[PDB]
Design a protein around this ligand. Structure first.
Ligand SMILES: *[C@@H]1O[C@H](CO)[C@@H](O[C@@H]2O[C@H](CO)[C@@H](O)[C@H](O)[C@H]2NC(C)=O)[C@H](O)[C@H]1NC(C)=O
Ligand SMILES: *[C@@H]1O[C@H](CO)[C@@H](O[C@@H]2O[C@H](CO)[C@@H](O)[C@H](O)[C@H]2NC(C)=O)[C@H](O)[C@H]1NC(C)=O
Ligand SMILES: *[C@@H]1O[C@H](CO)[C@@H](O[C@@H]2O[C@H](CO)[C@@H](O)[C@H](O)[C@H]2NC(C)=O)[C@H](O)[C@H]1NC(C)=O
Ligand SMILES: *[C@@H]1O[C@H](CO)[C@@H](O)[C@H](O)[C@H]1NC(C)=O
Ligand SMILES: *[C@@H]1O[C@H](CO)[C@@H](O)[C@H](O)[C@H]1NC(C)=O
Lengths: 466, 103, 469, 104
């Protein structure tokens, strides 16, 4: 009972799954047997659907209509299909949602209308879709949000309105969609939003506002008390306000890069015990270290391009579980102990104004891997400063006006960088330093201390550079 | 060239797909071959960007089809599907399983 | 053995320019010299021989002696006529002893002496003209001693001198005309002192001076006394405490070749400061926070390397490279550059580093015709658009760093054969790329792993290729 | 350890010399060995710093002994010595060669 040139196979017994994709059809066949629970019509150059279509397939659970050139759909085209759980209509040429054709399909769960040329969503053309939980309106020509059409979708759980031309979100725009968990609005043109434009969705866990034209921080975020994952990167925001993310504990990932940020309130990242990573580059106006009360589960902290002059002496009380710390490009002179910040593996304090490295300044960091103190003004390093660092393998002390050098500890790293220390004239031996494979020395004669047409063989052992 | 593919090379398969197709990269060990589908096969989710449409592997625990990262769409039969994420128990808020497992 | 001196016991000896005999009586743990030292000695090395007195019975009468060594011998003073008999002495060595002052007379009148070593002692006082009658002295070593002032008067009797070092001492001031008579002087070393102050005319004497070492000292301001040294070739005042280089600082010193002022807490440099030095090779300036505009380099076109970082330069003149041909290295990292000039005139450029700036666009002519260019770094910038033919005429290009930027695309025209490519940080850069277009690539960093993958990464004599997500 | 050497290692020879000795680095092909002399052998000049006293090879063409880099002190016999650097000609400013070749 399966059409010609199509491939077909049984379902959960009896019912028959049909694949009539890219055969370059003109119209469907009526040769379609009933008992069809799956119909794939795709890329088959279909214009009309049709003068003589076929509902009467009360077993159809999933129909695909991708790649077929349509513009509109007959109001009773899907009437006979009561068991339709998933409909696919992407990559066509609809200039508006079918004015009726789609209302009342109580079994429909997943509806795809992406990659069309739609610019208008008729008020409640989705009426009576009480089982719809997935809506795709990607790559379309929308200009505003279908607030009214959405009002009839309290069933929705996942929606995308990405790659459109939406430029504003009015208050309660998604107001009745309280079952919604995932909202994607990326790659639009949103320049303005209301104080209460996300007030509806109580269940929302992730929110994508990326690649848009926002000029200010979305304060409408505050009502999203169960938000877990937030993105508004690649916008035009200029600052993050004090207590910005107070309304959203249990947040896990926040994403605001490619944003011309200048200042961030030190309170902004308070009370997010679920946050893992924080990154902040080029924040020129930041003068002090952020308060991280109620957020101890940070694994990574990077804050660069600012004017931080000093760190609290108890900075590492809120930073256990921290694994990388990057405070490059700041104005630090005096450093704290960092010992309490165990589980630390990478430290980057380059381009700062540190002048001294004491005994306790990096002691008891058994997991430390990479330490960079390059481009600083470090004149004195206590000889036993690196004594208790078993895991240390990479060390950058370039450009630092050093005159001597500690051999206690670090007795087997692998990357060593000392160029720029002119007073560093001292000599060193290869023993002390097994596992060294990359070195850079202020003077060549020091490099020499490490050894530095037919066949030939490279036998690469070790490097050095004057 | 190939089917729905606007740029190929035997070394890498398809590199650029048709204006509205997804590129699927298959890891046949040490190699990567690209194809051009209109939907992504079970295990992957459809992702549309202005520059590139990729099928993306759905690293969601015990799941079959999914809407995106961190949101599953038809969790594994034998486990419950509650609002995107799938777990064995599930609310107890206003749900619990009935006939089919759709909390 | 047709002719064999005539040399003391346990010492080694060998002939000179015929007959005259060179003697090595160094480290024998001697106590005093022996007699029977034959004449015809043109070289006598007594060193590390633990001698106290020189002597109850010394030995002049060695009128053929050309060079005496007395290093490592524990001395305190020298008899006034110890060197009288030595008429042909051209070099005397007295370093590594314990003189607490220069022999008040003992060195006076030695008309043949050319080289005098008095370093590594504990001398702190130079008796007024203990150098009297030394019209052939051209090399003076007073290193590692305890001087506190310049022996002005004693130096006044040294118009013959050509090279002098007063390094590793405690001199903290140089008064005007301190070296006033040393007009034959070519090389002056004053490094590792404590010079905190010097006069406007402390170097007015030496007309012939070619190099000047003021390193590792305590200068708080720029030595303007330099102004009269019109024959200066090489200047060092690094590791001081200078905070700025004034406008027209090195005006008085054309034919300067190398200048050294690193390890100086510099803040500002006058834009004229480096004018009219056609012979300069390198210029380097880091952490000059207060510099807002590009230095003027009129009459200085022979720069081979130029680096100016850590400043507030907002923009470059459209004509920067008219003063900068022959440039090979350009490092203008850590500034506020947004708009870039053409660089075309800056040929022979081999490496360029413009990282951490605020550049937003790289136009067509921004790197045209740079045939010697190898490495280009534009990392940590805000480059969104790159003109498709921007890299079209760069035959030697092999390293390119575009990390941390705002790219979405990339020019494949030109550059179809580098070796280092760095694109991580470009998030919109989601496009795929092929192995063809890019042979010779061995090091890559990609915004997304699946892109790295297109190059295999998850004879063969070159090695394996790299890539990183 | 060794002679006049306050820190040694068989692999590299001496690493730090006595308070007032010079370290001479000998390039015995792909390897480097340091010794401690009180004067640097012909071809090298004595260099004094607070941290380290180095013997420095005198990279001046056609020269024998030298005061430092860029200033020669006893030029190659057969060549003339005018103000540090050596020439075949030489000034003609107020010099020229006389009896011995030391461009007055
Ligand atoms: C591609 O689609 C077009 C519709 O635009 C199809 O055109 C019809 O073709 C039939 C013959 O198959 C004609 O009788 C109709 O008059 C055509 N209608 C229109 C509106 O053009 C076409 O057949 C399809 N071609 C392929 C190769 O699939
Ligand atoms: C928006 O959500 C739905 C409409 O989709 C409304 O829920 C109805 O609530 C009544 C009782 O309160 C139930 O009997 C209906 O079955 C529900 N309908 C659906 C489709 O779930 C809800 O009232 C609306 N909320 C507001 C504030 O208008
Ligand atoms: C140093 O003493 C020696 C003594 O040996 C003198 O050398 C010769 O000594 C032999 C006997 O050993 C005599 O036959 C020779 O006549 C001596 N030669 C001369 C030239 O006198 C040597 O002269 C003494 N030199 C000095 C400077 O006192
Ligand atoms: C000089 O050296 C000898 C051994 O060479 C030693 O016995 C003597 O004590 C030293 N002189 C002094 C002042 O100790
Ligand atoms: C330098 O000192 C000598 C003393 O020997 C004197 O004759 C000469 O005139 C002095 N030169 C100058 C320029 O004063």
């Amino acid at each position: 009972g399966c059409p010609t040139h199509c491939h077909c196979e049984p379902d959960g017994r009896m019912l028959l799954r049909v694949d009539c994709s890219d055969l370059g059809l003109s119209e469907l066949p009526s040769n379609l047997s009933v008992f069809t629970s799956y119909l794939d019509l795709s890329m088959n150059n279909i214009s009309q659907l049709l003068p003589n279509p076929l509902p009467s397939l009360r077993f159809l659970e999933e129909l695909r209509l991708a790649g077929n050139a349509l513009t509109y759909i007959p109001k009773g085209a899907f009437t006979g299909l009561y068991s339709l759980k998933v409909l696919m209509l992407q990559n066509n040429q609809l200039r508006h949602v079918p004015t009726e054709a789609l209302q009342n399909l109580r079994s429909l769960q997943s509806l795809r209308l992406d990659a069309n040329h739609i610019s208008y969503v008729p008020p409640s053309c989705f009426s009576g879709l009480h089982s719809l939980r997935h809506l795709w309106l990607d790559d379309n020509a929308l200009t505003e949000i279908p607030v009214q059409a959405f009002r009839s979708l309290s069933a929705l759980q996942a929606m995308t309105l990405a790659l459109n031309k939406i430029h504003h979100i009015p208050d309660y725009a998604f107001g009745n969609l309280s079952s919604l968990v995932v909202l994607h609005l990326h790659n639009n043109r949103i320049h303005s939003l209301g104080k209460k434009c996300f007030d509806g969705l109580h269940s929302l866990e992730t929110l994508d506002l990326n690649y848009n034209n926002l000029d200010e921080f979305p304060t409408a975020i505050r009502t999203l008390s169960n938000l877990k994952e937030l993105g508004f990167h690649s916008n035009n925001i200029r600052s993050i306000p004090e207590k910005a993310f107070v309304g959203n504990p249990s947040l896990i990932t926040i994403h605001f890069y490619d944003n011309p940020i200048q200042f961030v309130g030190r309170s902004a990242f308070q009370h997010l015990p679920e946050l893992r990573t924080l990154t902040l580059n080029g924040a020129s106006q930041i003068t002090e270290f952020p308060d991280l009360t109620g957020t101890a589960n940070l694994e990574s902290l990077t804050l660069t391009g600012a004017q931080i002059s000093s760190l609290p002496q108890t900075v590492c009380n809120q930073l256990p579980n921290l694994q990388v710390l990057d405070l490059s490009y700041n104005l630090l002179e005096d450093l704290p102990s960092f010992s309490v910040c165990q589980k630390l593996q990478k430290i980057d304090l380059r381009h700062n104004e540190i002048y001294e490295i004491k005994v306790d300044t990096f002691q008891q960091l058994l997991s430390l891997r990479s330490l960079n103190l390059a481009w600083n003004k470090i004149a004195i390093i206590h000889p036993n400063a690196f004594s208790t660092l078993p895991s240390l393998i990479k060390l950058d002390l370039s450009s630092n006006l050093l005159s001597s050098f500690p051999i206690t500890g670090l007795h087997g790293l692998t990357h060593l960088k000392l160029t720029g220390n002119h007073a560093l004239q001292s000599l060193i031996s290869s023993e002390n330093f097994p596992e060294l494979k990359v070195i850079e020395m202020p003077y060549a004669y020091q490099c020499c201390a490490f050894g530095v047409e037919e066949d030939l063989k490279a036998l690469h052992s070790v490097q050095c550079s004057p | 060239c190939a089917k729905g593919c606007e740029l190929c090379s035997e070394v890498n398969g398809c590199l650029k797909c048709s204006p509205k197709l997804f590129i699927l990269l298959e890891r046949n060990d040490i190699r990567q071959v690209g194809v051009c589908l209109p939907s992504c096969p079970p295990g992957y989710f459809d992702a549309r960007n202005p520059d590139m449409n990729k099928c993306i592997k759905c690293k969601i625990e015990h799941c079959e089809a999914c809407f995106s990262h961190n949101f599953c769409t038809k969790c594994k039969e034998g486990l419950y599907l509650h609002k995107g994420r799938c777990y064995p128990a599930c609310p107890e808020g206003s749900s619990a399983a009935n006939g089919t497992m759709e909390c």
